[model samples]
Target: QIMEPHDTLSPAQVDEYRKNGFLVQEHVFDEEEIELLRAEAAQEFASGGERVTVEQGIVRGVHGCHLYSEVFGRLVRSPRLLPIARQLLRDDVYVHQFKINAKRAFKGEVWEWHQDYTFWHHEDGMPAPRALSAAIFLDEVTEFNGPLTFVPGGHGSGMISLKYSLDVETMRGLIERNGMVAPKGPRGSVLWFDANIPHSSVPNISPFDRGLVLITYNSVENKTDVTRGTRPEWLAARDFTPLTALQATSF
Candidate 1:
């Protein structure tokens, strides 16, 4: 029997995640909380500020927020997040990586289809694909804004192929096998997905923003033995200290 998690997720919802490798829960956060995050994010993403990361004159993503920001630090260990991680991974959990993806209007870049574990393993020497990403949407994820897309049963295929990507031929096969979905949802939604899940997003050409915080959690026992010199500590956490879950009110 599955252990009871936070009241937010039902047993069937947890099963849905285990089967399809992803689960999108809408309105998980209230407006007051969203406003709080919006104001904070607006400050971090202010006009003429380089608080975000860009590629080819188009913004891509921002990393290392939870390390310095007390808000994000607590958020990574909050009641709302930890229970889900613990229940899903069935063990103690610690943040493996933290990032804020910025898909700015008309200037956002497309994320090529890939699995996160390929890099974490080949580059960082992670032992296995035993992690998940918790995505918290700060802005509405619309079709024109380029929402995330994923194959339903992609994670069950194992380590994809000989290279980092499954390639067009193989990817087409999987798409035909399991189908795909680019879920569109309101702001304040959360999507918990497997780390090995093959997914990607399109360029944001709309007037809206599609920024979200992606907090990756790894089982405490699954820590990588080798430390990467190239990846910064914030990008690939060197510390594996088990996190103490804080009440939702702690943030």
Candidate 2:
């Protein structure tokens, strides 16, 4: 029985996500909307705030924009995002973390191969891999830019052994054995992926900016245990208040 007023993802799409550990949806947002978002992001990054992460004298990422910016605050609660998150987790969900990862042209750094759940579980004490990320591209993502590459069906294997080296040889063998995909889309596209999926991104060598707003949603029941470890509230939210979706016009 369908309970929602609307469903953004079809059954086949859901199954595809389950099978491949990720799903890429193109043009989830229109160009007009994306332009506003891009402009807002430009202002945010230029502010030189403490939440911004810089490397090699270049801004790489911005953490927790939703906490302060009214624009992003409403975006995290959009119907397009919240309802889909509820559908995927099949449980009431809350924002676990949020950030803007910017792969600036010719200066962006490489992200090492890893699983997000490893850090969430071991450090944050999250009980299960019942979380996912909604990554909305704010720029045109192409192979020339540092697009995220994922191992197909990688999350199916559960937590991979940490005993292996994370060197180039190890990653080469993994890709050779399991295969890989670099899903890219135009500005305003979105990608939903499981928390346990093995993924990484190469450095941006092209003359274009690659940026996305990444929002992590966790089932309300999977709140982090403070007794195990603690991080800044911006990194891992302590508030487990279940979220309600806002209409598309709200943002």
Candidate 3:
């Protein structure tokens, strides 16, 4: 469940998030924490056989890996993160899902711009309130390493018209008209955004790899089983104690 922020957000910042659908806090993680998580993830990957790769260099162990790793657990239960979530979605939030996106340089992988709600619409019935996500950078994210690009205020427009795929001209016009920008930062940086925001990422240009964790929260009002398909193992992972507490209680 979402927790109260240590300090309340300014009215303008809250308004911006409601209007634009996203907010970026460059460098949300400390250096030591980032390094520790990176090392642990590498070790886990080395011992892995059934890991899901959301993108190049990014491997996830379904839903509950956060419980197994100290670093991940800290991230999942972060007071700082919960505050931002509460500010946007209210205190009665539940974590609907989480994923890890690890991008390595030279992978040449590009994520097409799309909204998170695009996949959830069928399950959610329609757009709902208090649905948002946070992207936590574990490494220095820069333009050279496939930083995230987003269309400001795109979330309030509802989902885009992408029956098949977004055409180049359509994407350009959307970005131009909405004042699109890429959110970049060092480790510890967190971005709070609406699930309906139109966003994507480019291939890493630098030799170093970039790692990120996406944590999505929604008010209990819109809760549903949207974490199906990609990571079925999540079903078993949900039995963990921490998640049980977090899922059942409202912060």
Candidate 4:
């Protein structure tokens, strides 16, 4: 649904991403969209459900819960975002998953350095050419608000060296090599990056809490049904009858 493909990335921009694994774009979402999603997320959280504790101060819920809100659905279907995915993936795409992440300030929330695909690879019979995870910032993201950090061009190598776990020495090497940089931008910003990117975040150092929505899309070549156990909630949001057969194969 993107209006048009982004004027192809510059040679340097392409090289930078191939080297660093991520491309940061400012104001990817307009102010109106940002405000709407923010309001929606706030309402969802306030309504109460099982809260997941990731770090001391960070908690998330609605993981794979996109059908729960129209605002969230819009983010997943955003026209502006599709072009970026098409450029990076060079193919037609479909959203693979979505999640809402929230962190309260002064709660010491942090995510260890890691790659997104590590966990998925463990799942049986998954398809390949899985391309990008688009992260939309609903709140102004900064160092104080637990900004994300990533190793440049790391994705080019296709997965990080998983030495059981990411240790202090490994983390230090990543930073010293200029492989990592904090992705900072205003609210409504969207980050497009390869799935193999080595990324993580630090604790919120600011006074206000932070919130973000991540919409992951995969190439149609790798498309598989994601409809296993499709809930009533999911069906209510959009028509799924046409995709029923596809869903059976995916599960």
lDDT: which candidate is best? 2
130-193 per-residue lDDT for model 3 (tens digits): 5788887877777788888888887776666233345688778888889778877778888888
Where model 2 places Cα greater than 4 Å from the true spot, the runs are: 1-5, 161-173, 248-251
Q: Give Cα-based local distance difference scores for all models.
A: 0.78, 0.84, 0.66, 0.63
Q: What are the per-residue Cα lDDT tens digits for candidate 4 across 64-113?
A: 55556655655565557765566677777666666677766765556788
Ranking of all candidate structures by their lDDT, best first: 2, 1, 3, 4
Q: List the residue pairs that clash in candidate 3.
A: 27-188, 27-189, 28-188, 28-189, 29-188
Error of 3 at 209 (Å): 1.7
Worst 10 residues of 2 by lDDT: 161-170
* Candidate with more favorable, higher TM-score: 2 or 4: 2
Clashing pairs counted in every model: 0, 0, 5, 7
Give one digit per residue, the lDDT tens place, for model 1 in 3-46.
23455468999899988989998987877887787665555544
**TM-score per candidate, in order?**
0.88, 0.90, 0.77, 0.75
Per residue, candidate 2 scores C-alpha lDDT tens digits across 1-251 of 22246556899999999999999989888999888887777777777388888775677778877777888888888877888899899999998889888888896766778988988887788888999999999888899899998998888878762322257875677788789999989888999999989898888889988888899999998878867867777778888999987654422
Over 4 Å off, model 3: 1-5, 47-51, 54-64, 67-70, 123-129, 161-173, 225-251
Candidate 3, residue 198: how far the Cα is off, in Å: 0.3
Model 4, residue pairs in steric clash: 2-79, 18-153, 19-152, 19-153, 20-152, 20-153, 21-153
